[PDB]
């Protein structure tokens, strides 16, 4: 059996994932055209996003190079908020060699291995660019005698916060001995994830005095000044311009979920926007109608499902106090995106203000609180009347809107995982559907869900036999034996059921299979290595 194997490959036997909407009455070509519309919009988004990624990587390389190239000390650079994935490339100095030495915490178990990897990398790179030597710092001493030119070493320490600071301190003091050679220049790059003081409290005071002689702090995080998140959000708004709307609750969901991730913001923003685009193009039947070519393929189901709009509700109530009307309101542009573009351009250029969040600005513009958002700067009091926009309401906007009311984004991307496990185990009506064992299904709960309620009402240390006794009392003795005697083709079962302790034995078997299911799940633990007499509950519901 391959299920008892650790791993096995399968070669199985042997056109779009988009399904037919409108209660199964969608056209097949509407499905294909929705697939192509999603593909072109998704491509138009990601070309801009990958261009932005290339831009941020190139600007970071240029800024690090300008710091690296601008007597007897290190050239120290502290990259604050660094995730250590930046490619660092060096300049090709005439009659000098420049080598970059990368060092992770896994490659740094002690000072000896750190030096040995550094000297192997130096010797390998120098012989690659231009006899065996010993991989120690005498290779740095005799570098110009073998290679004929001087040396510039750039040490890039990745994940310093994870490194042993005693080992790092001793390696720095070891590298300090190389300053006595005229042909040696050493630069150090420290990728720091928390802050500078947390690492200055971990080094020696002599090491701090060593590093202070020539050092540069450079705060480069992903979430720095919102210069890159606003570009990605602007790329999305330029993609969905003239076809789709963003609700204010969706934008505030973006803000709330982006506030909870610090080191990796932009991938979360792209993931959330992408999944919302997927959900709209998978769910909404009017996704065909985002381009004016498809205005000649509307039917009675389209008119049935476009008539149930609260904006249409208010419009016909105001008219009191169809297909041509629905077609007529596609020519509009909804210029809120252009107004946000103009406001951001004005604030970046005329007022020289770069510290702003376009997602927050779009949220306040959707609500109608752009002035209360702009009050933080105290520099737009003379131009608020120029920069203010009244939010125009557009008919049939609900059929073209990215929103989260169903909780789909919450269930798909950031679920309350353990709370869902707990809620399913406690309730189980919302999971198991209601409909041989039909008499027992109405009376007896599933064994895990039944045991979880006793688990919930028990105390933090449960006696396992009293837990079993309570579980036995929850079960009916008559119907369980009737259901186990309903099958006459199992001779050992029919032999066991006629024994008078069959109810207790059956209850114990079900109880123990549920107890080790809970043990594998992590709900309970055993307070020994050899005993199985008391359990501790590890999980409380609602946390």
């Amino acid at each position: 059996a391959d299920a008892q194997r650790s791993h096995y490959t399968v070669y199985p036997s042997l056109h779009i994932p988009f399904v037919k909407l409108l209660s199964g009455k969608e056209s097949e070509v509407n499905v294909e055209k929705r697939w192509e519309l999603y593909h072109q919009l998704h491509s138009h988004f990601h070309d801009q996003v990958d261009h932005i990624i290339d831009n941020i990587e190139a600007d970071l390389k240029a800024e690090i190079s300008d710091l690296l190239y601008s007597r007897r000390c290190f050239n120290t650079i502290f990259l604050l908020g660094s995730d250590s994935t930046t490619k660092i490339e060096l300049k090709d100095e005439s009659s000098r060699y420049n080598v970059l030495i990368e060092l992770t915490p896994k490659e740094s178990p002690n000072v000896r291995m750190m030096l040995r990897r550094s000297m192997y990398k130096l010797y390998s790179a120098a012989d690659a660019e231009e006899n065996d030597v010993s991989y120690d710092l005498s290779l740095v001493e005799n570098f110009k005698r073998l290679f004929g030119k001087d040396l510039a070493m750039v040490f890039n320490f990745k994940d310093v916060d994870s490194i042993n600071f005693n080992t790092l301190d001793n390696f720095i003091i070891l590298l300090k001995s190389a300053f006595k050679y005229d042909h040696v220049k050493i630069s150090l790059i420290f990728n720091i994830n928390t802050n500078l003081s947390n690492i200055e409290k971990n080094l020696r005071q002599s090491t701090i005095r060593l590093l202070k002689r020539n050092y540069h702090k450079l705060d480069v995080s992903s979430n720095k000044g919102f210069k890159y998140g606003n570009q990605i959000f602007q790329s999305f708004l330029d993609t969905v311009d003239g076809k789709l709307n963003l609700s204010d609750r969706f934008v505030e969901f973006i803000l709330s979920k982006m506030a909870n991730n610090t080191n990796h913001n932009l991938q979360l923003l792209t993931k959330m926007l992408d999944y919302s685009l997927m959900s709209y193009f998978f769910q909404n039947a009017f996704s065909v109608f985002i381009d004016p070519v498809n205005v000649d393929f509307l039917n009675d189901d389209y008119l049935k499902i476009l008539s149930r709009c609260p904006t249409f509700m208010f419009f016909v109530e105001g008219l009191i106090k169809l297909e041509e009307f629905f077609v007529e309101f596609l020519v509009r542009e909804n210029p809120i995106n252009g107004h946000a573009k103009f406001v951001a351009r004005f604030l970046e250029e005329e007022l020289n203000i770069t510290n702003f969040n376009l997602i927050e600005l779009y949220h306040n513009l959707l609500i109608g609180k752009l002035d209360s958002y702009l009050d933080r700067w105290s520099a737009c009091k003379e131009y608020k009347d120029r920069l203010h926009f009244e939010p125009i309401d557009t008919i049939f906007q609900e059929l073209f809107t990215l929103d989260n009311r169903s909780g789909l984004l919450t269930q798909s991307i950031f679920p309350s995982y353990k709370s869902n496990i707990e809620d399913n185990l406690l309730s189980w009506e919302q999971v198991l559907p209601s409909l041989l064992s039909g008499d027992l299904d109405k009376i007896m709960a599933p064994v895990l869900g039944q045991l979880f309620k006793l688990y919930r009402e028990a105390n933090m240390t449960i006696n396992i036999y009293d837990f079993y006794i309570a579980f036995r009392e929850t079960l009916p003795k008559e119907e369980i034996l009737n259901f186990i005697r309903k099958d006459p083709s199992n001779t050992k079962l029919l032999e066991l059921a006629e024994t008078p302790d069959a109810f207790d034995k059956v209850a114990l078997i079900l109880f123990m299979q549920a107890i080790f299911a809970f043990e594998n799940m992590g709900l309970i633990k055993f307070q020994s290595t050899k005993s199985y007499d008391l359990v501790e509950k590890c999980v409380w519901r609602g946390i």
């Binding site: 916060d161 994870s162 994830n193 928390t194 500078l196 003081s197 947390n198 200055e200 409290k201 005071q205 002599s206 701090i208 005095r209 060593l210 590093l211 202070k212 002689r213 050092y215 979920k257 506030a259 909870n260 991730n261 610090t262 080191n263 991307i413 950031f414 679920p415 309350s416 995982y417 353990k418 709370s419 992590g522 633990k525 590890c538 999980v539 409380w540 609602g542 946390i543």
Partner: protein, 222 residues
């Protein structure tokens, strides 16, 4: 720097250099001890700013030069997270430096339908200042209970905060940033119930964190 400021404003130059060296020694000998290298570092750091206060009035009177350049003989000057993550660090500090059997005497604020009494609290306070010693070890669930006890907030509004994907991702990141430690450091499985947790930040760092979110942690140690 010295010659540039004389132009832009030989025994006398030796006198001002030796007076600077003697002032550095007399100001920082208790700090450095008899370390030649530390005093060399302090001389190299404090020479240009002392140079930048030399005037024509200051060049012949060394007491006036010591009065103008005074602030660099008083101090050595040899130096160089999200909402959930900060509150998880605060809760980890609380879990490490408070005893778990006093937990229900502090954070418990919900009313009761069943009859019951909360913990009375400590009958007399100890004089040991537990933040001077090494932190205690705690479980994940106590950390989650204290985290949602002190995190900020009609019928479906879900007033408390559950531990969703974001909370566990932030806690995993805190273990990655070494702001939270375990007993096991290599080949550690996060999922075992025998794995315990402790904070490793100083009191000043968690004070800066608690005041960055305007949380009053110093009430809990009073």
């Amino acid at each position: 720097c010295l010659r540039k400021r004389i132009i832009e404003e030989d025994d006398q130059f030796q006198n001002v250099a030796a007076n600077f060296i003697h002032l550095i020694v007399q100001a920082f000998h208790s700090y450095t001890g008899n370390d030649i290298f530390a005093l060399n570092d302090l001389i190299d750091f404090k020479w240009p700013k002392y140079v930048s206060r030399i005037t024509k009035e200051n060049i012949f009177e060394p007491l006036a030069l010591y009065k103008s350049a005074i602030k660099l003989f008083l101090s050595t000057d040899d130096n160089l997270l999200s909402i959930i993550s900060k509150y998880l660090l605060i809760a980890s500090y609380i879990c490490s430096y408070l005893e778990p059997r006093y937990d229900a005497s502090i954070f418990s604020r919900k009313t009761r339908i069943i009859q019951g009494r909360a913990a009375y609290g400590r009958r007399k306070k100890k004089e040991v200042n537990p933040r001077y010693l090494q932190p205690s070890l705690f479980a994940i669930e106590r950390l989650l209970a204290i985290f949602q006890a002190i995190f900020p907030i009609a019928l479906r509004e879900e007033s408390l905060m559950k531990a969703n994907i974001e909370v566990f991702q932030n806690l995993s990141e805190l273990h990655t940033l070494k702001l939270i430690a375990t007993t096991m450091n290599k080949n550690i499985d996060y999922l075992s119930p025998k794995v315990r947790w402790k904070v490793n930040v100083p009191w000043e760092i968690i004070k800066e964190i608690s005041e960055s979110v305007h949380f009053n942690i110093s009430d809990y140690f009073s």
